[PDB]
Amino acid sequence: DGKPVWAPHPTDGFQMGNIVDIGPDSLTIEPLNQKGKTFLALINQVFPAEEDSKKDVEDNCSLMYLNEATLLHNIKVRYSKDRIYTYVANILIAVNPYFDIPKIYSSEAIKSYQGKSLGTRPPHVFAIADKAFRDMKVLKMSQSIIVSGESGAGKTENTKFVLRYLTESYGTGQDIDDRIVEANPLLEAFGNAKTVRNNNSSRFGKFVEIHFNEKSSVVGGFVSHYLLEKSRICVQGKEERNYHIFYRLCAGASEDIREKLHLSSPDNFRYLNRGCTRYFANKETDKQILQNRKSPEYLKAGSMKDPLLDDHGDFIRMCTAMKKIGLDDEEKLDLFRVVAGVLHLGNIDFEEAGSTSGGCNLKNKSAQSLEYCAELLGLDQDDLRVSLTTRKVPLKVEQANNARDALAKTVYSHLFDHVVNRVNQCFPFETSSYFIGVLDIAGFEYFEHNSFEQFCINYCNEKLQQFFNERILKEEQELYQKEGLGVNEVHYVDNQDCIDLIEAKLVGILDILDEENRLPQPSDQHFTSAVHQKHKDHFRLTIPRKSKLAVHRNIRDDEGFIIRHFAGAVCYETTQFVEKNNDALHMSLESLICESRDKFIRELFESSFISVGNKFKTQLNLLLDKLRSTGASFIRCIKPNLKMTSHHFEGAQILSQLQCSGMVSVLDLMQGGYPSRASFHELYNMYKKYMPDKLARLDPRLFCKALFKALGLNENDYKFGLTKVFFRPGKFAEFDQIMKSDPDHLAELVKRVNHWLTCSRWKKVQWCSLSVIKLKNKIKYRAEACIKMQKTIRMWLCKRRHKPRIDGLVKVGTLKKRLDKFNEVVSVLKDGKPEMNKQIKNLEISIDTLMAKIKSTMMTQEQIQKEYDALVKSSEELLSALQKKKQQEEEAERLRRIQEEMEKERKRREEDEKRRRKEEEERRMKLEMEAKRKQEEEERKKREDDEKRIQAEVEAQLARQKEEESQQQAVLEQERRDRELALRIAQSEAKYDLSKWKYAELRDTINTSCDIELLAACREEFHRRLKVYHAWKSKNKKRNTETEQRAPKSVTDYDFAPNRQQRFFRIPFIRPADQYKDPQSKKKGWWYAHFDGPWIARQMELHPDKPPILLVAGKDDMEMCELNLEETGLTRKRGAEILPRQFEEIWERCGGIQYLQNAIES
Amino acid sequence: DQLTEEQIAEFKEAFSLFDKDGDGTITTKELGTVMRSLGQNPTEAELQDMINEVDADGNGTIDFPEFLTMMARKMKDTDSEEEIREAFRVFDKDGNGYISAAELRHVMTNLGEKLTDEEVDEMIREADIDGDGQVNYEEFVQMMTA
Amino acid sequence: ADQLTEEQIAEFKEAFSLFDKDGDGTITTKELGTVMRSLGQNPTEAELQDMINEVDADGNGTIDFPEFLTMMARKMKDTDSEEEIREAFRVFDKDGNGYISAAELRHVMTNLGEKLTDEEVDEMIREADIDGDGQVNYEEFVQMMTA
Ligand SMILES: Nc1ncnc2c1ncn2[C@@H]1O[C@H](COP(=O)(O)OP(=O)(O)O)[C@@H](O)[C@H]1O
Ligand SMILES: [Ca+2]
Ligand SMILES: [Ca+2]
Ligand SMILES: [Ca+2]
Ligand SMILES: [Ca+2]
Ligand SMILES: [Mg+2]
């Protein structure tokens, strides 16, 4: 009974299906694909579908229907056509394709997007970069392209493309533009690794700020780093590698380099062989790497393939890169020396002495590694094992290995810091005006076992998602309300509770954990317990016994917790948080190392509990301060599948990301919101430099007004607010066109605006004269309506005053001519003359007496009707006496004929009399009917006044109940997000019970069963389900389309107010007092309505210029109203109630009996 | 002109009844006012015009063949009752079947050829025109013409 | 066809902007009177009060713009549209010679109150003249009107 729709699905996310049933809270949908399969699907999860599946639109806000399902389908169609990038009104969804799409990243593509307003070209990341540059040149404030997405979504690659565009379209050909991009592979080698979710996994979040001068030319760059994951350097997972540099060094070092650095196969270092040891290489590169490098496990298993990375090739690439960025061979050897020093420092394994005195000693095998580490890091053997064996308090084996790993972590952290500083000084800058800074943070990541690094990464994801919420939803709705545009405000899931949970003071997790560390006896269990103590009832933090996944249920209360991030819930084992908090490398190590003899080591470290968490909190607060100070353009990268396969697009994961990231809410907001904003004053002064003096005399908003038609723009595009002028989505090619500063273009627009304005100054006056003429002719209209008024008033005055007599004396004149006719036959007869003579004189006495009585004075109609009523029986007595005389006088030929024709004429008279009496009595009884109905509505008004019912308290509690229900709806949505993330983790690891009845039966058992009470609740249910379905068609409305009027607006909009009588009614669709005041202007004419019983039965709408649209129940009920008569308030409307048969008259002149017969057939 | 014979009979009949002079002539001043007697509906302009053309001879009185012609071209161009009801519904505020009696009084008195108080009182009382219950103008219209 | 097009409604919005001198959005019989008597007609306060009470939802005396469009609404004749447009042109054309000079536009602009210089009215005629003969005719009005 309609068009197919979208429905929930486990794997493809959302699926295509037709509606079979209309339940109370579900639409029982039939998946067409798997015929026979069937489920109930909630109201808030069934969505309308696109007319044709093959259409793909570049901007989703230009879709017919706007909702999550159509967004996911648009992406799915575009993805298979090799167009991964998509728009949502200013936000670019970039689905990562997992394969090098050709002919779109070459310089010829970068050559096209320069200066093109987004929308004039296919969506692409370069268009976001160019919009960023355009808004930085025009608005003259810095901007940040906040790339966000999950771990494995395509953040680093999109950042590289942004930098490549910004340096190859807006550089000047120096070395700096080349360096800004070629710096990325070096940092890539030194700070990225193979996670489970990604092969090139950014373990540090960077903010590459391409600084610009006043002249909008690149001046340099500045690359910052936040939270280099430092636990990897020492311990690595089963299928994870350390940072690439430990491997590119091994697989790429030459013969002399191998001899100097004392390298070997990666399995020979403890810091590496605990994880994946296999290089990355293609066939040619695999053959290229020398056999002595490859570990035996690499022979046993083989190289893994990534579309972009290749270990040996990457080492040659980064050698060229270091040479380009100005790293001489000496600095290169220094970096590789520190790397090899970290590598070796793992092999020094500490043994305990034979006596249980805490003697920390070393093996015989570590002796060679001891010398190698001493030489590499510029240290002395004596100093080294004195520093490590004791602290000189002797240590234990656990503390000794902790010490080794602490030194390794500190050295690698400072090595990364020095690499970043050298890269920064590759492209220096003193002063600049603006910066375009991409932000590639390590995205959300969750694993089977999560530790402090995952917790902080997800915390940074939390803050950046809160920033996105504030920038695109909170700030935008605040601005919209300041302009009061009446956009239907959309509610977003605020993450502020989770931020407050992590970063607070005396109640926050990080500060509670600092408190834990500053106790003399630190304890992980104590920190977990304290967090469960200070956050007893908080919504976000959950003891894992109350989890969804069974894996985390094993961890009991005082060892871990689960936090519902925006992306979902992640179980953080609080094992070893207390140690990973600390940045206090003991004085032993710092002393050990500052007296190293190598210049490079000293230059490294020349740059007491100090929490990593508080340091990271400060870092992120500073980063967010920079971001808030700037504008922002957003890219949402989406990972298609959790299996790294190309050309595979799993709906469930992508839709979980879309709901988690708030992109769905942004679509629900931009369904009516205006992406492009602008100040009136900016335009006014922007054109005043060229726009002449006279045209400026307009109001600034007037001159902006005439501007938009010089372009011939549509009035469905803009909506002027208080201090801003807006533009709908999908209209950028004209907004940036308005922002053009071309003097010839501005002169052309000046001339066009001048002409449109002088046109309007014609139009105003001409239409004013037409309005004057139309009012004058409305005067003529009302004057002549009133003259017809007066005509009828006077005629009816003289119709009850004279005309009654005229009718009565028409009857009397009939009788008089009849007496004239009788007198002849009276003379004809010859027996009993005298009594006939008495009769005839009596009758003529009646005649002339009544003629005098009428002509003399005024008499009522009823009086003369009585008089003629008597004289009728007088003529009857005449006739009867004539029959008896006939029976006693013989004039056969004369009398038989004459008398019988008198009898016939009398009978025809009497038939007329019965007819007229019936006519008049029916008219009277009709007002005996109407007057009673008018008194009925008056008495109903009186009863309503006497009742004095009050519902202010009722609605007062109803508002609170609605707010509470919204709260539980948000809670249910959060629980759905949590269960979706849990499923993702599981996938990664591997008297009348009519409430049940259908809409179907109800429509059928409404149209057959005559068991009274059946239709009590049947009609009631069927109408309740109908309200639910109209609600579903109301929330899911085509945006360019208006609402559906199945009843006049007056009837449905009386809802401000809260029997078998076949009450008929009639209401204008538009009340003629509101004729031109209907912005909808959709349905016009008379809404006839038969209400039979508690619910509508039949209806009708004669449009002014259309054939009729009849309905009836048990058949067309989708255009018949569902409202109860009382809600219609038609009892409270005056004169709506109508005559029974008047409906049935315009009914039958419009196929009444015919449409009824059709309903009988149906 | 041609017309039904019974209607000519009624015309002669009404002409005869109200012959106060008794010489076979109707004086116009009452003639037009009672000429309204039949459902034909003249204005003040039309009654004025027929006075002028009847008094064009300067007599001030009429005779029945003239009156027959009078009513001939009077009925020849007459207003449809639907047009009357259109005029009634011009003033209907909300299309609710009722015009509030004062608005109605305002219409008759204020607009056009002024109509006097007594007629509107005849409306309010005799014509079932409730001041509280605004006239249901269809009902009036009916009773007005029928 | 009592309803109007959206474009007709917008151009009437401009017209009301000319009635609504102060821009408050509401007008009482005073302004209707001043402008209408200025533009040649002679009404009386009684029937303007009648029309207002016809389109005064609150009976306050002031007329909102949608009520103003509604007060225009009428069961017109099909020929009445051309009839009233020609009466409008004659309102613009005092002599009724079918062509407006600079002087006639001058006078009408003065009466409605928009302050114009004698070069501006010449510019008005020259911009409204598609045929460019120097003075405006009727189908030129219509093509200006809908435009
Ligand atoms: N536009 C693109 N074209 C081709 N491959 C891409 C693109 N974007 C991402 N990738 C793929 O993504 C992988 C790296 O993902 P990355 O961007 O490093 O994730 P993250 O930024 O989350 O660390 C690479 O193997 C690369 O092939
Ligand atoms: Ca005003
Ligand atoms: Ca008002
Ligand atoms: Ca002229
Ligand atoms: Ca011309
Ligand atoms: Mg990354």
Cβ atoms A512, A532 nearer than 8 A: no
- Tell me the ligand closest to A204's alpha carbon: 6
Which atom of ligand 1 is closest in space to residue A161's alpha carbon?
1
Q: Is the minimum distance from the CB of A280 to ligand 1 under 6 angstroms? A: no
SS (H, E, C) A537-562: CCCCEECHHHCCCCCHHHCCHHHEEE
Q: Which of B86, B93, B111 has the CB atom closest to C50's CB atom?
A: B111
| d(C-alpha A760, C-alpha A755), whole Å | 9
| d(C-alpha A166, C-alpha A210), whole Å | 8
Same domain, A717 and A849: no
- Copy the structure tokens of residue A27: 């639409």
Q: Confirm or reject contact between B91 and chain A (CB < 8 A).
A: yes
CA distances from A851 to A807, A841, A863, A1011, B86 (A): 13, 15, 14, 66, 40
**A18, β-bridge pairs:** A30
Cβ atoms C101, C90 nearer than 8 A: no
Among A28, A73, A81, CA closest to A52:
A73
CA distances from A637 to A82, A93, A152, A218, A650 (A): 16, 6, 9, 26, 15
Architecture of domain B4-77: Orthogonal Bundle (1.10)
Q: Could you give the angle at the alpha carbon of A825 between the alpha carbons of A822 and A831, nearest 5°?
A: 120
Residues B110, C54: C-beta atoms closer than 8 Å: no
**Cβ-based neighbours of B81, under 8 Å, separated by 6 or more:** B141, B145
Q: Is the minimum distance from the CB of A151 to ligand 1 under 6 angstroms? A: yes
Q: Taking the domains of chain B in order of start, what are their residue ranges?
A: 4-77, 78-144
Same domain, A829 and A920: yes
CB pairs under 8 A between A and C: 123
**Cβ-based neighbours of A817, under 8 Å, separated by 6 or more:** none
CA distances from B113 to A454, B109, B140 (A): 92, 8, 21
Among A462, A474, A249, A447, CA closest to A981:
A447
Cβ atoms A246, A268 nearer than 8 A: no
Which residue has a Cα nearest atom 11 of ligand 1?
Answer: A98
Q: Which segments of A50-180 are extended strands (E)?
A: 85-88, 91-95, 143-148
Resolution (A): 3.5
From chain A, the residues in CB contact with C140 under 8 A are none
| d(C-alpha B13, C-alpha A812), whole Å | 11
Among C127, C116, B68, CA closest to A751:
C127
| d(C-alpha A979, C-alpha A568), whole Å | 8
CB pairs under 8 A between A and B: 125
- Copy the structure tokens of residue C86: 């020609």
| d(C-alpha A276, C-alpha A188), whole Å | 18
Among A939, A1160, A933, A935, CA closest to A1061:
A933
Q: Could you give the angle at the alpha carbon of A133 between the alpha carbons of A130 and A134, nearest 5°?
A: 85
To the nearest whole angstrom, how far is the Cα of A472 from the nearest Cα of chain B?
A: 46
Superfamily of domain B78-144 in the CATH hierarchy:
EF-hand (1.10.238.10)
**A455 — phi, psi (to 5°)?**
-65, -45
Q: Which of A926, A944, A962 is the last residue of a domain?
A: A944
Residues B103, C46: C-beta atoms closer than 8 Å: no
Q: At residue A170, what is the residue type?
A: Y
Left (φ > 0), alpha (ψ -120 to 50) or beta: where does A310 sit? beta
| d(C-alpha C88, C-alpha C92), whole Å | 6
Residue-by-residue DSSP string for A636-685: EEE---TT--TT---HHHHHHHHHHTTHHHHHHHHTT--SEEEEHHHHHH
Q: At residue B33, what is the residue type?
A: T
CA distances from A501 to A509, A552, A563 (A): 6, 21, 9
Q: Which helix (H) or strand (E) holds A445?
A: none
Provide the 8-state DSSP code for A484: T
Q: CA-CA-CA-CA torsion for A211, A212, A213, A215, nearest 10 degrees? A: 180
| d(C-alpha A690, C-alpha A678), whole Å | 19
Residue-by-residue DSSP string for A908-935: HHHHHHHHHHHHHHHHHHHHHHHHHHHH
Residues C1, A1081: C-beta atoms closer than 8 Å: no
| d(C-alpha A1031, C-alpha A1056), whole Å | 18
B 18-77: CB under 8 A from A = 18, 33-34, 36-44
Residue A1004 lies in a domain: no
Q: Could you give the angle at the alpha carbon of C140 between the alpha carbons of C137 and C142, nearest 5°?
A: 120
Q: Could you give the angle at the alpha carbon of A229 between the alpha carbons of A226 and A235, nearest 5°?
A: 170
Q: Determine the 3-state secondary structure of A839 from DSSP.
A: helix
Q: Give C83: exposed, middle or buried? Use CB within 10 Å, 0-12, 13-18, 19+.
A: middle
Name the residue in chain C with its Cα closest to that of A768. C15
**Cβ-based neighbours of A7, under 8 Å, separated by 6 or more:** A14, A15, A16, A17, A27, A29, A31, A39, A41, A45, A46
Quickly name the fold that domain C5-78 has.
Recoverin; domain 1 (1.10.238)
Cβ atoms A151, A444 nearer than 8 A: yes
Residues C54, B111: C-beta atoms closer than 8 Å: no
Q: Determine if residue B55 is labeled as part of a ligand binding site.
A: yes
From chain A, the residues in CB contact with C147 under 8 A are 759, 763
Cβ atoms A654, A638 nearer than 8 A: yes
Same domain, A813 and A926: yes
Q: At residue B90, what is the residue type?
A: V
Among A187, A317, A365, A339, CA closest to A263:
A339
Among A626, A612, A648, A249, CA closest to A451:
A612
Q: Confirm or reject contact between B96 and chain A (CB < 8 A).
A: yes
Residues B91, A796: C-beta atoms closer than 8 Å: no
- Copy the structure tokens of residue A42: 């909630």
Q: How far is the CA of A162 from the centre of ligand 1 (A)?
A: 13
| d(C-alpha B61, C-alpha B21), whole Å | 10
| d(C-alpha A1107, C-alpha A1112), whole Å | 17
Q: How far is the CA of C28 from the centre of ligand 2 (A)?
A: 7
Q: How was this structure determined?
A: cryo-EM
Bridge pairing between strands A91-95 and A85-88: antiparallel
Residue A347 lies in a domain: no
Instruction: Please count the other Cβ atoms lying within 10 Å of the Cβ belonging to residue B42.
Output: 20
Q: Which helix (H) or strand (E) holds A1099?
A: strand A1095-1102
Q: Which helix (H) or strand (E) holds A1141?
A: helix A1140-1148
Class of domain C79-145: mainly alpha
CA distances from A24 to A124, A320, A508, A1033, A1095 (A): 44, 68, 44, 14, 19
Name the residue in chain C with its Cα closest to that of B108. C50
Cβ atoms A203, A193 nearer than 8 A: yes
- Copy the structure tokens of residue A843: 């009758």
Q: What residue spans of A427-567 are helical by DSSP H?
A: 452-469, 475-483, 496-503, 509-517, 524-534
| d(C-alpha A697, C-alpha C117), whole Å | 14
| d(C-alpha A54, C-alpha A77), whole Å | 7
| d(C-alpha A68, C-alpha A87), whole Å | 14
- Copy the structure tokens of residue A505: 């003071």
| d(C-alpha A667, C-alpha A62), whole Å | 11
| d(C-alpha A112, C-alpha C98), whole Å | 57
Residue A823 lies in a domain: yes
| d(C-alpha A345, C-alpha A405), whole Å | 8
Q: Which helix (H) or strand (E) holds A430?
A: none
Which long-range contacts (C-beta less than 8 Å, at least 24 apart) are formed by A704-710? A704/A680, A706/A753, A706/A756, A706/A757, A706/A760, A707/A683, A707/A738, A707/A749, A707/A753, A708/A738, A709/A752, A709/A753, A709/A756, A710/A749, A710/A752, A710/A753, A710/A756
| d(C-alpha B34, C-alpha A795), whole Å | 9
Q: CA-CA-CA-CA torsion for A294, A298, A302, A305, nearest 10 degrees? A: -70
Residues A803, B122: C-beta atoms closer than 8 Å: no
Same domain, A913 and A857: yes
User: Position of tokens 């909170």?
Assistant: A474
- Copy the structure tokens of residue B59: 């007599």
Name the residue in chain A with its Cα closest to that of B43. A791
Which residue has a Cα nearest atom 15 of ligand 1?
Answer: A154
Cβ atoms C55, C46 nearer than 8 A: no
To the nearest whole angstrom, how far is the Cα of C11 from the nearest Cα of chain A?
A: 7
Among A72, A78, A116, A69, CA closest to A97:
A78
Topology agreement, domain C5-78 and domain C79-145: yes
Residues B93, C54: C-beta atoms closer than 8 Å: yes
Number of H helices, E strands in chain A: 43, 24
Q: Which residues surround ligand 2, an ion (CB under 5 A)?
A: C 22, 27
| d(C-alpha A91, C-alpha A1001), whole Å | 47
| d(C-alpha A339, C-alpha A343), whole Å | 6
From chain A, the residues in CB contact with B97 under 8 A are 1134-1136
Residue A849, domain extent: 803-944
Q: Which of A944, A972, A999 is the last residue of a domain?
A: A944
Q: Could you give the angle at the alpha carbon of A1025 between the alpha carbons of A1022 and A1029, nearest 5°?
A: 130
From chain B, the residues in CB contact with C47 under 8 A are 110-111
Q: Which helix (H) or strand (E) holds A745?
A: helix A743-797
Q: Which of A792, A855, A1134 has the CB atom closest to B17's CB atom?
A: A855
Which one of C38, C65, C69 makes the best mutation probe of the A interface by having the most chain A beta carbons within 10 Å? C69
